[PDB]
Design a protein around this ligand. Structure first.
Ligand SMILES: Nc1ncnc2c1ncn2[C@@H]1O[C@H](COP(=O)(O)OP(=O)(O)OP(=O)(O)O)[C@@H](O)[C@H]1O
Ligand SMILES: Nc1ncnc2c1ncn2[C@@H]1O[C@H](COP(=O)(O)OP(=O)(O)OP(=O)(O)O)[C@@H](O)[C@H]1O
Ligand SMILES: [Mg+2]
Ligand SMILES: [Mg+2]
Ligand SMILES: [Zn+2]
Ligand SMILES: [Zn+2]
Ligand SMILES: [Zn+2]
Lengths: 409, 303, 272, 614
DNA sequence: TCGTGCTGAGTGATATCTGCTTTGGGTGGGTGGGTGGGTTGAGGCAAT
DNA sequence: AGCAGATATCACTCAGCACGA
């Protein structure tokens, strides 16, 4: 009942925001508006809201347009590869509605399995599969990776909630045999252009990085043997791969994008934490070099694309996206990247009364970022009038002027 | 995309039907009663609903009954499954035809009773009660509920085609190879029909303003509520106020489409309505009817 | 850029040629010569003729559209359309230069504020009794009134309507199905409208009858009907001096009835 | 900057908005008083206090939204004379601007006054303005094309009103592929259906379905109006105009009611046929109405109690009933007692005993009998006027008819049914159909009307009193013959009336002279008709007398004495129930809850006087 | 890892042709209905 | 004449490779 009341209130706020777009009188009342452009030409719009408001007038002008630019989406049927429906293609937010008793039974079963034999099952499976890697079909790779990722993440969540049950039940993920198996699977999937196995390996690697971060948080002296693992896993080739993932993410499904984003977040988190804590040797790790590696037009594009779908995401995805944006804008000072129009339009959509609920921390992040971005954009525009034109177009790649554009000096 | 709010309404409804008590359980016992006698309709007192959950559940159902009704049925089936597994299936040799039961939810005891003259468009899709005098009753007809079709070309089968106010047919063959789009034949053997009756009522004479023509309304009865109102009776109907389109306009197989002095102009712009317009009519869908106005067998009846 | 009729703020009518003027100049006045409905044949179509008869029906004044103004949601320009028929097809697509050039598909929406309308009234004129031949049924002719001539014709008035006899072609499938047979009407242009005290009054009520002084005085009293009906207590004494005449056949009851009804302004004659 | 202008004019919307806001914020009725040349009637409190601010505050307190605006007040203010002219010329845009401005000021009041009133409730409401008094009222025959799309005033009589018609406002669409929903507004009745799903992930084209029952609708109603009788120049058939009312104005005026309507004169094209976009040259005119006008308290209870406390209440009521009728005190008293009526008893084990009183007014035609019925109608809160064998009247019995308007079967109730709880006056009882007589007998016996025709089996309550009038067979009532022969009615039907009055115009010099004096003068306080009706309603609604032991003894003794008078039967048991009802009615008249000996004494006397005539 | 074509077949889309049917009236019928209109005059029947 | 369904011929998007930088 409490959740139902909260949802009803949310719908009430949405309806209230919708009300401003509806006319009190009936449709056939017949009010005609004339709006004057900066040049002396008058455009005609219909509707009471048009007369009473200007933003509504321009929105109607836009909306009334008939011509649509073609959008081509690269859709792959999961049944084609023989895989079942899973987290890879299931829409984000799709929730299995358990009953209380059934949920309790399922949680008890999973907890007992994780405390009894997850370690042994993972060890046996990893041995059998690394002994017979080449015979793997796509289904087995996806299956192994998804099982590993799901159970590791569930144990992490339960450890967070309950102080008793702890990481030592899923400690077998840390061991190097499983780690190298997962890394080889992901790298081969990448190389052969098998995007579904790529996605599964992405998820598994994200869970592994979160796990290793928790283990380091546990004890440093006991985590020297895990500093070894961190050094092994952040190999230059792997760095390159991880960096490349985001750049390609934009082409594929939403879920791909989200996994890319999350893995990026985890990678940067571990990199920064382990650079601050101590020195890293793979070849010493230069966190700034990696960071820089992460700063290019495809990455940003990817991010933008993912953020466009903000009415279906939770607050965590928005928080990660804007953490990345903060890294870009402030820490990296690569501001030219973000001086685009996709971001401006999307931010207007986010901050509009109809876009995001006022009572939300996501709106707080968006408002802070928008304030900073608008301040810096105003300063740049005051400096260089050319940037008004510039905004419209991708960055120039000219030796002469490129620097000037990018940094203003 | 799932309806998050609708699912929570189903979750709340399941608790109400399973835990409400007044001290024996009221609706758990009622579900058992329907199991023994093999009854479809289940009666819920609206007064009881308002008590549980602070009244949020009752208020949500009241405003939006058309929207949340499908989710209420989902919740009822789950509770029926847990305690009366055999109730889900419809009631010498093996019978091959045993389809799922079509449960009907009937409400009553609403706080307010409206007049026919008090009906407005703001309450469309809301649960409310009205009172009137029955004038005319139509005969009972079978109404298509869940149609099943077979492909002309490849003989493929399409099932569970929900029907709107008009006749509906598939558009896309489920066969990858097959190209059939607009060539279908209905299959009556696998289809499901429901009882349907049209009742015409008018406002009571006492409520009629002096020197005024009585107001009229159309009430539709389904399932067990059929043939429960006779002409001349004064009945109290509880149900949902709906709006009925002009099915003609929408386009019907084999049907050529086509007070107010031409000022009743319908809505246009639809694809279906290429150059035509759509008009609307207010009707009533009732789920509960109350008509205000040998030795061994007899002995058993008495207490 | 716009039709000339759109900005016109006047109406034009033709006054027939007076018989006196035509005879002064040795000419025949066809236009002003009265004609019956029967005498109006198909060879008179398209001419200025006069009709004599009694109006039997007049419709309500309604606005007839002549020029229709449209608007473009995208362009911002105004389009116009001329209507000279019973029916018209509305515009759907913009035809402006800007629209065409830019390829923008803009929808046209009717605007009644800037449109031009003219008052319209349809009347029926029927033959007079003296104009029908022997053993024939009277005929009627339609009349169309446009502009300021509206409200110049009322039922029951004998008039000399001058107008232009024109056909009314059908449109669409009706046109094809009808054939060569055409309806007709008259475009109204000019309308000419045709036109001791007690004892003396009593005797003058009905001179043709033999002297019945008392009955005539009673008829005068009924006709004047003087009364003060202002009780104000809930009812008021009836203000009508009703008169009833009863007698054997032979008295001129019908003559008194007809005369007293003719004199009265509101007198109505009916038969049981 | 974008500058918004009303199409076809040069008036700025911003200027109109600010002018209207200033007018609403600061305006006093003293400006109207000076404008109307009534400056010397100005007081110091009401005329110097803000008017529309108070109106808005009261509207917020009561939760209403509609605001009534007097157009003359705009002229009363210097700024808004242009706004008044624009409203007269361009009503639609000005009205929309006024609605938005009203909402803006309503929210701004709470914002500035930092009141505790909830703001979310205000934000979700729709506000409207209903201007009136926009100039002299024209006639339905004076509406030319020049008046199109302009604000007009029209007075007339309502003739019919169609049922509520749902008018679409917002269209609700659903995706067939992803179960995604979106609402699209409607402009000029055109649904703006999406070409494809708005979801990035789901871009499925041409897969949107309209859910009819999940859309937002409005109330519409069409009303036919006829010009007032004075508008007819010669006496021809009056013309009529069609009206449209939306939202609150729906059901704001019933048939037969004279109203004044303010609205916009509009023209709409009519399609030739249903298949095509083709339109008729001739346009249809109608009025978009924006405002419609139609042309018990503690103090009331105190006045009623004061009147009841008066000693000569009976005579006062008798005089007030029929001021214009001379020397019929007994008939007036009987009519008063019938109007107040007896106590209705709802018995368990016994059934139903009627508390109504029936009176028959028979006698010579010269005497005043129909005027008494008209007075009774004017006084009774509920009742109908009917004459037996009368086509003009609706009818005395329920019947099944056909609704010509709608071509529908409708059960229409008769005059007796419509009089439930009131007094039904039948002017001409003598001439009446056999069927009607049987219906009257059933009504006066069972108090219900039963019909079993047209497939309908129903019973209608007819708990109403009857006050009928009758005339003799010939030119006068012959005293020699008995009443039954003279009235020419069945003895059974004539024996059911509690009181039978024989008002006879006997030729007496004194009586004739006095009647002549009264009649010629027509060319003891009296109560107003309205107050008498209110008193009767209150007495019939609240007071319920009960019989006491003394009343029982008096009734028994009176009945025994009446029976002992007469073998001839002087009285029957009906003469006892009639006395009981009359005593209860008299007790009701004095606002007493107990029947005392005085009421029984009055009852025996009224009953006896009628019996003496019999 | 940017820029500039050359190739390219796939995935559209929109500019472009092929067949009803209609009004209303029996020069489409009564296995399309009579609550989608027409419709005043004669005729037979029951209650009166 | 107008309207709804359909054919077929019209472009445009992502796809990817050779040179050089
Ligand atoms: N006083 C009279 N002087 C001259 N002619 C008279 C007189 N009275 C009656 N008539 C003639 O009587 C003829 C027939 O009578 P009329 O129709 O006037 O009245 P009526 O006899 O009362 O009628 P009805 O026969 O219809 O009852 C009329 O043509 C009228 O000319
Ligand atoms: N007591 C009276 N006081 C005043 N007026 C009286 C009285 N008695 C008779 N009249 C007059 O007698 C006339 C009777 O008119 P009314 O309409 O009442 O007649 P009625 O009873 O309906 O007649 P009928 O039986 O002929 O139809 C009226 O003018 C009324 O003024
Ligand atoms: Mg005669
Ligand atoms: Mg009378
Ligand atoms: Zn098929
Ligand atoms: Zn245009
Ligand atoms: Zn969709």
């Amino acid at each position: 009942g409490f959740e139902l009341s909260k949802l009803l209130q949310k719908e009430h706020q949405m309806r209230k925001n919708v009300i401003k777009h509806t006319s009190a009188r009936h449709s056939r009342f017949g009010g005609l508006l004339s709006i004057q452009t900066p040049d002396k030409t008058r455009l005609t719009v219909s509707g009471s809201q048009a007369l009473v408001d200007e933003k509504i007038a321009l929105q109607k002008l836009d909306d009334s347009k008939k011509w649509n630019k073609r959008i081509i989406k690269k859709h792959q049927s999961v049944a084609a590869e023989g895989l079942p429906n899973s987290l890879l293609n299931s829409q984000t937010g799709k929730a299995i509605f358990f009953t209380e008793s059934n949920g309790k039974h399922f949680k008890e079963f999973i907890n007992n399995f994780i405390d009894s034999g997850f370690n042994i099952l993972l060890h046996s499976v990893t041995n059998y599969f690394t002994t017979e890697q080449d015979r793997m079909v796509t289904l087995e790779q996806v299956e192994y990776l998804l099982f590993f990722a799901w159970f590791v993440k569930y144990q992490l969540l339960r450890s967070k909630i309950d102080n008793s049950a702890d990481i030592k039940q899923v400690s077998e993920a840390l061991k190097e045999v499983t780690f190298i198996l997962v890394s080889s699977l992901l790298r081969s999937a990448y190389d052969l252009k098998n995007w579904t196995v790529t996605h599964a390996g992405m998820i598994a690697f994200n869970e592994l990085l979160n796990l290793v971060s928790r283990t380091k948080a546990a004890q440093e002296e006991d985590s020297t043997d895990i500093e070894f693992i961190v050094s092994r896993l952040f190999s230059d080739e792997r760095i390159q791969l991880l960096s490349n993932l985001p750049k390609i993410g934009s082409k594929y499904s939403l879920q791909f994008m989200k996994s890319c984003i999350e893995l990026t977040h985890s990678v940067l988190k571990v990199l920064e934490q382990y650079s601050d804590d101590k020195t890293l040797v793979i070849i010493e790790v230069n966190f700034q070099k990696v960071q820089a590696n992460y700063m290019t037009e495809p990455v940003i594009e990817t991010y933008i694309n993912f953020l466009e779908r903000f009415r279906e995401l939770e607050d965590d995805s928005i928080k990660k996206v804007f953490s990345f944006f903060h890294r870009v804008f402030v820490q990296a000072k690569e501001q030219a990247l973000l001086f685009r129009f996709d971001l401006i339009i999307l931010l207007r959509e986010m901050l509009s009364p109809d876009g995001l609920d006022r009572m939300s921390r996501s709106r707080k992040y968006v408002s802070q970022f928008s304030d900073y971005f608008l301040a810096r954009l105003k300063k740049r525009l005051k400096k260089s009038p050319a940037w008004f034109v510039g905004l419209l177009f991708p960055p120039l790649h000219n030796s002469e002027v490129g620097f000037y554009q990018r940094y203003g000096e | 995309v799932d309806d998050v709010t609708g699912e929570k309404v189903r979750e709340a409804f399941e608790q109400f039907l399973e835990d409400f008590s007044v001290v024996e359980k009221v609706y758990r016992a009622q579900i058992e009663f329907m199991k023994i006698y093999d009854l479809n309709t289940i009666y819920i007192d609206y007064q009881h609903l308002s008590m549980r959950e602070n009244g949020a559940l009752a208020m949500a159902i009241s405003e939006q009954y058309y929207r949340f009704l499908p989710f209420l049925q989902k919740g009822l089936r789950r509770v029926v499954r847990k305690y009366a597994p055999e109730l889900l299936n419809t009631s010498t040799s093996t019978s091959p035809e045993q389809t799922e039961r079509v449960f009907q939810i009937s409400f009553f005891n609403l706080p307010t009773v409206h007049r026919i003259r008090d009906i407005r468009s703001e309450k469309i899709g809301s649960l409310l009660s009205i009172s009137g005098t029955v004038t005319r009753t139509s005969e009972v007809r079978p109404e298509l509920y869940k149609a099943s079709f077979t492909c002309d070309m490849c003989r493929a089968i399409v099932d569970n085609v929900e029907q709107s106010f008009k006749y509906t047919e598939p558009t896309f063959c489920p066969n990858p190879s097959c190209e059939n789009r607009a060539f279908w034949t209905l299959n009556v053997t696998r289809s499901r029909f429901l009882d349907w009756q049209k009742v015409r009522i008018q406002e009571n004479a006492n409520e009629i303003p002096t020197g005024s023509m009585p107001r009229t309304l159309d009430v539709i009865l389904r399932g067990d509520s059929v043939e429960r109102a006779k002409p001349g009776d004064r009945c109290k109907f509880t149900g949902v106020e709906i709006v009925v389109p002009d099915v003609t306009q929408l386009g019907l197989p084999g049907v050529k489409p086509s007070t107010t002095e031409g000022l009743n102009s319908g809505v246009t712009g639809l694809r279906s309505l290429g150059v035509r317009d759509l008009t609307y009519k207010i009707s009533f869908l009732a789920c509960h009817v109350i008509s205000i106005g040998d030795q061994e067998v007899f002995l058993n009846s008495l207490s | 850029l716009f039709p000339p009729n759109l900005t016109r703020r006047y109406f034009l009518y033709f006054k027939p040629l007076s018989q006196n003027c035509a005879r002064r100049y040795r000419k025949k006045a066809i236009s002003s010569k009265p004609l019956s409905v029967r005498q109006i044949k198909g060879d008179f179509l398209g001419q200025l003729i006069t009709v004599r008869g009694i109006i039997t029906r007049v419709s309500d004044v309604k606005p007839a559209v002549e020029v229709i103004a449209y608007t473009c949601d995208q362009c911002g320009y105004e389009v116009f359309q001329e209507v000279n028929s019973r029916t018209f097809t509305p515009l759907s697509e913009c035809t402006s230069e800007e629209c065409s050039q830019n390829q923008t598909k803009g929808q046209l929406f009717m605007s009644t504020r800037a449109s031009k309308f003219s008052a319209f009234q349809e009347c029926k004129i029927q033959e007079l009794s003296q104009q029908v031949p022997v053993g024939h049924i009277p005929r009627s002719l339609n009349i169309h009134v446009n502009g300021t001539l509206v409200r110049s014709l009322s039922p029951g008035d004998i008039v000399d309507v001058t107008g232009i006899f024109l056909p009314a072609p059908y449109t669409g499938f009706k046109a094809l199905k009808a054939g060569l047979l055409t309806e007709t009407y008259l475009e109204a242009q000019f309308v000419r409208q045709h036109k001791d005290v007690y004892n003396r009054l009593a005797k003058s009520i009905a001179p043709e009858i033999y002297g019945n002084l008392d009955v005539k005085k009673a008829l005068l009293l009924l006709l004047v009907g003087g009364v003060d009906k202002r009780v104000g207590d809930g009812m008021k004494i009836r203000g009508d001096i009703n008169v009833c005449l009863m007698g054997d056949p032979g008295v001129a009851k019908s003559q008194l009835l007809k005369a007293i009804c003719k004199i009265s302004p509101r007198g109505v004659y009916t038969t049981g | 900057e974008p500058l918004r202008i009303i199409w076809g004019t040069n008036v700025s919307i911003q200027e109109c908005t600010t002018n209207f806001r200033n007018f609403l914020m600061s305006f006093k009725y003293k400006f109207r008083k000076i404008l109307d040349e009534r400056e010397e009637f100005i007081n110091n409190t009401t005329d110097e206090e803000l008017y529309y601010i108070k109106q808005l505050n009261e509207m917020r307190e009561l939760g209403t939204s509609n605001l009534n605006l007097d157009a003359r007040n705009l002229l009363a203010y210097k700024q808004t004379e242009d706004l008044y002219h624009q409203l007269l010329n361009y009503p639609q845009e000005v009205i929309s601007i006024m609605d938005q401005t009203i909402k803006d000021c309503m929210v701004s009041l709470i914002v500035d006054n930092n009141l505790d009133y909830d703001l979310d409730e205000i934000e979700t409401k729709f506000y409207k303005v209903r201007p009136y008094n926009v100039g002299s009222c024209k006639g339905m025959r004076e509406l030319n094309p020049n008046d199109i799309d302009k604000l007009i005033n029209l007075k007339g009589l309502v003739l019919r009103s169609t049922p509520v018609i749902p008018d679409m406002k917002v269209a609700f669409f659903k995706c067939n592929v992803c179960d995604h929903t979106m609402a699209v507004e409607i402009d000029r009745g055109v649904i703006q259906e999406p070409a494809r799903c708005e979801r990035i992930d789901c871009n499925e084209p041409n897969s949107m379905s309209l859910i009819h029952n999940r859309c937002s609708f409005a109330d519409k109603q069409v009303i036919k109006l006829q010009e007032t009788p004075d508008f007819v120049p010669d006496g021809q058939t009056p013309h009529s105009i069609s009206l449209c009312v939306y939202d609150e104005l729906v059901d704001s005026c019933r048939a037969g009611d004279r109203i004044e309507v303010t609205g916009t004169f509009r023209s709409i094209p009519i399609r030739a046929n249903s298949r095509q976009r083709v339109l008729k040259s001739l346009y249809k005119t109608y009025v978009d109405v924006v405002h419609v006008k139609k042309v018990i308290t503690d103090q009331d209870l105190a006045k009623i109690r004061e009147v009841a406390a008066r000693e000569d209440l009976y005579s006062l009521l008798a005089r007030s009933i029929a001021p214009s009728i001379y020397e019929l005190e007994d008939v007036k008293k009987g009519i008063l007692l019938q109007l107040f009526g007896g106590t209705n008893k709802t018995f368990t084990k016994g059934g139903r005993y009627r508390g109504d009183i029936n009176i028959l007014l028979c006698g010579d035609p010269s005497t005043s009998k129909s005027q008494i019925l008209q007075y009774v109608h004017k006084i009774t809160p509920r009742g109908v006027y009917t004459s037996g064998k009368g086509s003009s009247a609706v009818g005395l019995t329920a019947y099944i008819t056909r609704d010509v308007d709608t071509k529908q079967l409708v059960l229409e109730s008769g005059a007796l049914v419509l009089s439930d709880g009131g007094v039904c006056c039948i002017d001409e009882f003598d001439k009446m159909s056999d069927s009607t007589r049987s219906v009257l007998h059933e009504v006066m016996e069972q108090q219900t009307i039963s019909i079993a025709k047209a497939g309908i089996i129903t019973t209608l309550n007819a708990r109403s009193s009857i006050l009928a009038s009758a005339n003799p067979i010939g030119s006068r009532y012959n005293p020699n013959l008995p009443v039954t022969e003279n009235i020419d009615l069945p003895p059974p039907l004539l024996s059911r009336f509690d009181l039978v009055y024989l008002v006879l115009d006997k030729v007496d010099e004194k009586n004739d002279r006095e009647l002549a004096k009264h009649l010629t003068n027509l060319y003891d306080d009296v109560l107003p008709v309205e107050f008498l009706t209110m008193y009767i309603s209150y007495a019939k609604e609240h007071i319920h007398p009960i019989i006491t032991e003394a009343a029982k003894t008096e009734l028994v003794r009176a009945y025994v004495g009446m029976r002992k008078m007469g073998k001839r039967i002087t009285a029957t048991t009906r003469q006892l129930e009639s006395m009981i009802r009359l005593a209860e009615a008299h007790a009701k008249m004095k606002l007493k809850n107990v029947v005392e000996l005085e009421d029984v004494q009055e009852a025996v006397r009224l009953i006896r006087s009628a019996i003496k005539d019999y």
